[PDB]
Paper text:
PLpro, required for proteolytic processing of the SARS-CoV replicase polyprotein, structurally resembles the ubiquitin specific protease (USP) class of human deubiquitinating enzymes (DUBs) and has been shown to have both deubiquitinating and deISGylating activities.
In order to co-crystallize PLpro with ubiquitin, a semisynthetic version of ubiquitin containing a C-terminal aldehyde functional group was employed for crystallization. The PLpro-Ubal structure was determined to a resolution of 2.75 Å, with one PLpro and one Ubal monomer comprising the asymmetric unit. As expected for ubiquitin-specific proteases, the body of ubiquitin makes contacts with the palm and fingers regions of PLpro, with little perturbation to the overall enzyme structure. The interactions at the PLpro-Ubal protein-protein interface are comprised of van der Waals contacts and both direct and water-mediated hydrogen bonds. Directly adjacent to this loop, the hydrophobic patch of ubiquitin (I44, V70, and L8), often the focal point of many ubiquitin-protein interactions, makes extensive contacts with the side chains of M209 and P248 on PLpro. The flexible beta-turn loop that blocks the tunnel to the PLpro active site in the unbound enzyme undergoes a significant conformational change and becomes significantly more ordered as it interacts with the C-terminus of ubiquitin.
Residue numbers in the entry:
A (entry chain B): 1 to 316
B (entry chain A): 1 to 76
Write the structure that this text describes.
């Protein structure tokens, strides 16, 4: 009359599915512990009829599946799956509208920051090393960003609903991007202590915190010298596809044809809200699902992105 | 050794640390000295982000260096 077969697959990494068959009445976690279905912690529930021809998620077991896990996520954190899944349950419910040629995110659970992140990535010539993030990303550029967004939260150790910093979040992400040929060379000139040269590669090649202006970093920013005077730091060589200038939110003028895109942070020492500014045939302000165009802008900017190929200096 | 931490307002504090000290621990000396919760603190060196899980020695911080204290942003 019946059978104890529901026929579903178990995996860790979307790609390669395994197969373990259990009874119709045997629950999932009483035998294989932490198990999920699209985020739904199905650890304590009975198998059904719709559960067929599908796929499932579990923690690795035989120390081979931990290798199969790493070769998709680039992490050895076992808590990653749970924090990713507990967050996918919420992200799957969000809406991803095409504002101004790009995939955005509708206001929800304080995701405005995640919105700037996603909006800027689609403007930068960048790729991910981790396969999870590159596949999730491809779908995200098409309107399917529920997994991308959940990933980001997981790589950043942030929960849904939690407030966030776009710069810090970009940093967690670039850790998993290809920036090995990214190269920045800085000189610091002290009147007394002499001239030092330093080289930076990887993420640190493309991040900076202290000025929004890429042009200031080329003509000299003022830093303290170890001897008590002020010295002058300046870019001597940059090799990357983009740079990201960042500074504590402060009023800044944004006029088209001088930058790529950017993000503003309106708020205070506690709370705050991000909206994204991008440059097209004119300026687009993108707050979540809302667009506004303007000739010029001025407001609390905190990060600016600039296109780069290769730059060398005209100083010393 | 002693090092300096410059705030957003431009106020400079002297700190007593060792090149073995972690960024985490450096934040504890700051908290003890200016009452600022470590989860708000982010430490910058001449524009370079000092990663939270690391040490002064990782970033070649010398005696009498000046570090910049910025705030972790909290955007919704
Ligand atoms: Zn000096």
């Amino acid at each position: 009359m019946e059978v104890k077969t529901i026929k579903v697959f178990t995996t860790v990494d979307n790609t390669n599915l395994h197969t373990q068959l259990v009874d119709m009445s045997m629950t999932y976690g009483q035998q294989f512990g932490p198990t999920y279905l699209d985020g739904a912690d199905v650890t304590k529930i009975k198998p059904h009829v719709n559960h067929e021809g599908k796929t499932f998620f579990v923690l690795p077991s035989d120390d081979t599946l931990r290798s199969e896990a790493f070769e998709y996520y680039h992490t050895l954190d076992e808590s990653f799956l749970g924090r990713y899944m507990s967050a996918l349950n919420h992200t799957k419910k969000w809406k991803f509208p095409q504002v101004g040629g790009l995939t955005s995110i509708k206001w929800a659970d304080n995701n405005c920051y995640l919105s700037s992140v996603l909006l800027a990535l689609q403007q930068l010539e960048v790729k991910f090393n981790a396969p999870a993030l590159q596949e999730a990303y491809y779908r995200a550029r098409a309107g399917d960003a529920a997994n991308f967004c959940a990933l980001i939260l997981a790589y950043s150790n942030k929960t849904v609903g939690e407030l966030g910093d776009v710069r810090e979040t970009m940093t967690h992400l670039l850790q998993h991007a290809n920036l090995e040929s990214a190269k920045r060379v800085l000189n610091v000139v002290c009147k007394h202590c002499g001239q030092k040269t330093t080289t930076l590669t990887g993420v640190e090649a493309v991040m900076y915190m202290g000025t929004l202006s890429y042009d200031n970093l080329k003509t000299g920013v003022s830093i303290p010298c170890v001897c008590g005077r002020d010295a002058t730091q300046y870019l001597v060589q940059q090799e990357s596809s983009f740079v990201m200038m960042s500074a504590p939110p402060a009023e800044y003028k944004l006029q088209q044809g001088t930058f790529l895109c950017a993000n503003e942070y309106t708020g205070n020492y506690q709370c705050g809200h991000y909206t994204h500014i991008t440059a097209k045939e004119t300026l687009y302000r993108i707050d979540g699902a809302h667009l506004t165009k303007m000739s010029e802008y001025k407001g609390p900017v905190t990060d600016v992105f600039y296109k780069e190929t290769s730059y060398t200096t005209t100083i010393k | 050794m002693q090092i300096f931490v410059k705030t957003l307002t431009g106020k400079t504090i002297t700190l007593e640390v060792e090149p073995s000290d972690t960024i985490e621990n450096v934040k504890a000396k700051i908290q003890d000295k200016e009452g600022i919760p470590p989860d708000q603190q982010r430490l910058i060196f001449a524009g370079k982000q000092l990663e939270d899980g690391r040490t002064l020695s990782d970033y070649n911080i010398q005696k009498e260096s000046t570090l910049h204290l910025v705030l972790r942003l909290r955007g919704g």
